[PDB]
Amino acid sequence: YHGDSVASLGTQPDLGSALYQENYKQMKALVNQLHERVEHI
Amino acid sequence: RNITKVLIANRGEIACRVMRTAKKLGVQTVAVYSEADRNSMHVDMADEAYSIGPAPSQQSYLSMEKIIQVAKTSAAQAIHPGCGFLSENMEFAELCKQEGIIFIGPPPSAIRDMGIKSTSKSIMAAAGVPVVEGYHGEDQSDQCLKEHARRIGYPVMIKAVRGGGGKGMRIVRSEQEFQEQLESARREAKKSFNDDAMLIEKFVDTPRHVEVQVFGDHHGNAVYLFERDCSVQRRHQKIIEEAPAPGIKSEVRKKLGEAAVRAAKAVNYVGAGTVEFIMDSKHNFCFMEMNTRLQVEHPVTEMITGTDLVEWQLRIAAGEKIPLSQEEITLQGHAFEARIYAEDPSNNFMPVAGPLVHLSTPRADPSTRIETGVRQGDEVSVHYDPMIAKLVVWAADRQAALTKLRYSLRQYNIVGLHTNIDFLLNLSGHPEFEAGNVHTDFIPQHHKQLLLSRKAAAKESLCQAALGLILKEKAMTDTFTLQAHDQFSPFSSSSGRRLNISYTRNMTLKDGKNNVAIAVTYNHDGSYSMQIEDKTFQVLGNLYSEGDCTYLKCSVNGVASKAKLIILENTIYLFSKEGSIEIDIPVPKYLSSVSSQETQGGPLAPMTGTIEKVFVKAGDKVKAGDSLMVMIAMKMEHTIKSPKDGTVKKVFYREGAQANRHTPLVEFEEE
Amino acid sequence: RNITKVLIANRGEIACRVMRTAKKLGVQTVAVYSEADRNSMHVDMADEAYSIGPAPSQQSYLSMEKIIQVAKTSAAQAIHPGCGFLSENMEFAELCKQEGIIFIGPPPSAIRDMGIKSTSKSIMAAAGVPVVEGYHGEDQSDQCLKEHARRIGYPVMIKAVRGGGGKGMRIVRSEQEFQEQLESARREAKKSFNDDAMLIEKFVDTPRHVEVQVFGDHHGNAVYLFERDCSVQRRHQKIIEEAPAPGIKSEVRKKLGEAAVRAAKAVNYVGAGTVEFIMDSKHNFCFMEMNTRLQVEHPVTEMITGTDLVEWQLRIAAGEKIPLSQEEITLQGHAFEARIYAEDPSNNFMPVAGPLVHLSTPRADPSTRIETGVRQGDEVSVHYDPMIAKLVVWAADRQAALTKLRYSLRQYNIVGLHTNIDFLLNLSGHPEFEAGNVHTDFIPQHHKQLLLSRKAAAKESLCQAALGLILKEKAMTDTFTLQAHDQFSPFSSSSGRRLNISYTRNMTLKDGKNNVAIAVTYNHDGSYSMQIEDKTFQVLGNLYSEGDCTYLKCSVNGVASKAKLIILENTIYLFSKEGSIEIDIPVPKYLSSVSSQETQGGPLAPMTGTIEKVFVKAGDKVKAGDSLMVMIAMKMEHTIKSPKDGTVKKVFYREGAQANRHTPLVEFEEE
């Protein structure tokens, strides 16, 4: 029997928060940098 | 003109309706769709489908340029506009003609001439059709206003030209009281609105919305198709339509249609038209307007005549003559149509958007027609009309048709959003509606009975709900057993058996606000003995599947019944021809997340709409019930009110901003 | 006479047709079959079935003794001959009568009297029906030949009695040129054939093959069923039939039938008969012949009258009177019939034998009737007729019926052999055919319009083909995943995903002789970006199954369409109502057998046929295009030609030998 309901992790982040906006911008730049370097390789 | 390919410049049920007839005739079908309609039933139904841009109809289905461009690119010879959107647009019908595309509808001249009330009345009066009506007057002389009040008779209502909410409004029962009531109304209007202009509108009575289906051709020959009663309306929205109209004699209707037919010949109207009449309690009728399109309620006419009006529209737009003579047309039986709206009748018939999580439907027979443009899992859209489906029935007698519709409505099941179905069940069972005593004020007059509160459930219903829960657990056990190597172990049974004693289970179910304690005993024979309070019930049943719907067959204390069972989230839905009952399964606290978050922010926008007014500064002390903002959505005013007595920390929107649904409007200081 | 059991002395669609009506009436059905028909649909459809010997019809379906023996052994009271075989055999109908078996057809006298043209014309002329015709003359006096030319009326054609290929044929436009042209034709005929006998056959006008369905009874009462246009014929073979014949007035047809009816009463014809007329451009008609059987094209008559002609044949053969009076018979709508042949129109309508690897069919409705005696996987036989099925439609208007047939033909799919379906689509869409301007020379006159070359495919079609191939690979991956223990591994997905880059696949597809390079990029969202040359397309779709046919639902650059997808061998078949496209998948060289046998020992016999001529000795030097042998197959002459300039090593066959299909005819010396 696997029908038991259970709790789940995670919470919705505050997309409007300045910290979230800054963190997203910085991480996105790193990912874009990673992608274009692989393209050259 | 050979119409081998048609573009349908519409969506939803009417697009599917047109495509069904086009395909029956061997005509190729072209759909158009917005980004929001990419997966709609009419897109999948067409032979070709083209994107016309984003979800807002002004940028998609109302974009004449895009529709003409798709008609050219698909090489469609004809455009069927359906109903609404571009169907009554004169510029679009002229543009189709300029581009050599057949508009399947009336000529641009007939659309124009009927689109202006004063023009349409003047043409109708000249054609013999009666022009009488009650209307407001823009002249403001006391003598002129008094002469007009006399013309429309007494009693009359004086109202202010500006403003709402009953301010500056006066009933005048006789000519002697007119002057005093006019001066009273003017003083109140001047005080409230700085305007003393008064209006004088008061038709003696407007009891019946009786309308005639008329059909014309390019040749100019014109025919009528009896009449339809659309008197049962809420805020001028038609709710139940019935053809033929009850209590109108065949002779009277024949005369009624003939006067309308002469007007139809006068404008040489081509394609289907509807002459709307106001009918009094003496069956005198007067022309109201002419809708220059196929009506929504055309299926009740089709069911009583055996005609396909869309098929006739395609043939006549191709240039063929009317298929049957007036002598050939015959009437058999009576028919009814109810419109399924995504509305909450208990909340003043507010439109509701959301998913169709369950959309079971009555089985369709020639008498029962489901005009559905939506399928289970479809989401109703804020951009488009809220109608879910239209149900029409034909019967030998009108009373039998009413019985069939009510049985059918019970079989229709809609879960995921509020609907008007229970309101339609109350309305179709109202004694005055059964008698055929209908008029345009029927819903306002009977509002008290047509809307009613929930009543406590019977103990038998609770027993059935508990049985359904137990059987669902048994089904889950069988599902687990399917994947196990030990397929036949006695442990996989759902007997709930014990050694030398009987297992009694304490279950709790919530009916409304009441918690019901049920003691269920698992019997050796497979039945269940349920005790609720001081009463004991012997319950036995099983689950069987018809189509995609699970059915519960149960017997309580020897009484056998069948019902449709759906268990979604923590609610048990039981659908039976007697009625529908919802039972709530209590949610354990530990799983309740045990995380209450007070009330951050203020009321979320009821929907996506422009902010029209802001009543709160960046730092303002407010008390519960203090209006914070006013928002207009699809032309419906909502005023946001203060949830708490806390001072306002900040405001997220300013006036003129468009706020998306459920977005925070105000920030309140933490206390 | 109580007919409770009927033997059907036929095969294929007509046997199934008769059995359907017999079973509807509660009559038991007996099939006969050859060894080649053991698994045929009519064998499985019958209540009993009996072997009548080997595949050649002369030793099976034409063996009167075997058919009578089976009728006796099965205790069948009646024999239904169907059409062809023994249906017009007088000796067989008399043998049935001698043996006390009911022949379901005309009496042996009517079969005889109609089987000889001179006898039939003399009876028809005596019955009032017109006898005029253009005929050849066996007298060879210059005066006699000239008198006959005048009676026929100029222009006339002089031809030699012996020989073919236009030799000895002179056209004569007037009486003054007759002598010179006759002497010219005689000198050429004497030089070419050693015979100076000339024929004199000309017909100034023979435009229409209009025929009347007539029904008679043992009582002698006779009725007609309007008329059918069979003018669209290739080599006299009827291709498209229609009822009623266009442009013939109801009054004219009534007169046309009445003159035929008098002849039918004159021979007291019992059972269905057809009076074939030649009709001129002025609608004057003359008797041509009477077919003493059910016609192949009887379904177009049934669709316009609502009658079952086989049901009437069974009732009348039992002795009952005609069911409906001439007054009772009424005509509604118009109907069309197209003969689906296993023929190659591009190769001069050569018959083709082979497997029905795919045989998808249009869904059948009362208007759409599929008269099919074959099922998917059935093999067309060299011994029997090449027809695959017959498609008939009924509509309110003739133009609508033509539209329905063309839409339906597209839904019909036949893979494994060549068919006339694309020729029927071109013919049914020809402007003169749409106008109803038909005559017996229509196909010869419009040959160029009706037969056309392949055109290069659009880039969207190539994108759809690539999408279908990718989806087939995905389906194969899912099939493999089904049998694996690691059911949910991400590797089982068909995402084609890479880390920090996008996967681009270089695919090559062949359209005709052109190789097309497609660069497919697997997007994260599941769509595909395809670049062909300088154009980029956004492609997304999926595979869904309707019945047994896989369908591809795709959208290219926002344009959505549905098509039937079949991937057989290295060809991708895409069937859409727009059309059908075939795309070839290149075959890797390694898989292709390297160094396949190169030498081919002479052209292989086109089919199994007698060798009529041998032009090569055991050792003879030949050049490409040198005729080696002449073979006759089913009365069709084929001349084998030298493939190479090599000297002939040996000959495997001599004159009069029967050579099986694809058997080596000549051996060439190795060089």
Ligand SMILES: O=CCCCC[C@@H]1SC[C@@H]2NC(=O)N[C@@H]21
């Ligand atoms: O704008 C959309 C349609 C409903 C509102 C239009 C208002 S009704 C009062 C005024 N008179 C008109 O003819 N139009 C506007």
Ligand SMILES: O=CCCCC[C@@H]1SC[C@@H]2NC(=O)N[C@@H]21
């Ligand atoms: O033999 C089978 C039927 C077709 C060929 C028969 C030929 S046609 C010329 C000659 N005249 C006849 O009546 N029969 C043969």
